C-alpha cells in the first residue's frame, strides 16, 4: 500500500501556502516524514476508474492482508497514544 487512493476535502485559501496537508495516521502506511519528502499526486477522472481504484482506498488497506487483523500502520501514532494513556491511566 505504498500508493494511496485519497479524496480531496478542502482547498487551502492562503495563496502563498504550497504544502499538502495530510492526516497523521497515514504517515506510517506510506512510509514518509515531514522532513522534506517529495510525494507525487496523479489525479483520477473516469468514473469506472474511480470504482476500480476504490480497492486502493485506505479503508481497504485497513485490513491486514498478512494476518487478517486490524492494521497497525493505521493504529494510533506516538502522541495520541500518549494522550489516550493520560485519559485512561
Amino acid at each position: 500500500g505504498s500508493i494511496l487512493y485519497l479524496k480531496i476535502g478542502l482547498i487551502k485559501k492562503d495563496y502563498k501556502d504550497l504544502t499538502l496537508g495530510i492526516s497523521n495516521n497515514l504517515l506510517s502506511a506510506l512510509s514518509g516524514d515531514y522532513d522534506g519528502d517529495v510525494l507525487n499526486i496523479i489525479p483520477v477522472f473516469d468514473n469506472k476508474m474511480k470504482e476500480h481504484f476504490s480497492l486502493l482506498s485506505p479503508q481497504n488497506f485497513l485490513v491486514d492482508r498478512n494476518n487478517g487483523r486490524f492494521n497497525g500502520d493505521f493504529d494510533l501514532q506516538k502522541d495520541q497514544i500518549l494522550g489516550i494513556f493520560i485519559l485512561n491511566n
Binding site: N24, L27, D33, Y34, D35, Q77, D79, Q80, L82, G83
Partner: peptide, 10 residues
C-alpha cells in the same frame, strides 16, 4: 505538544 500537531519534527 499542540493538538497532536507537533508529531515528528513539527
Amino acid at each position: 505538544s499542540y493538538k497532536n500537531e507537533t508529531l515528528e519534527d513539527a
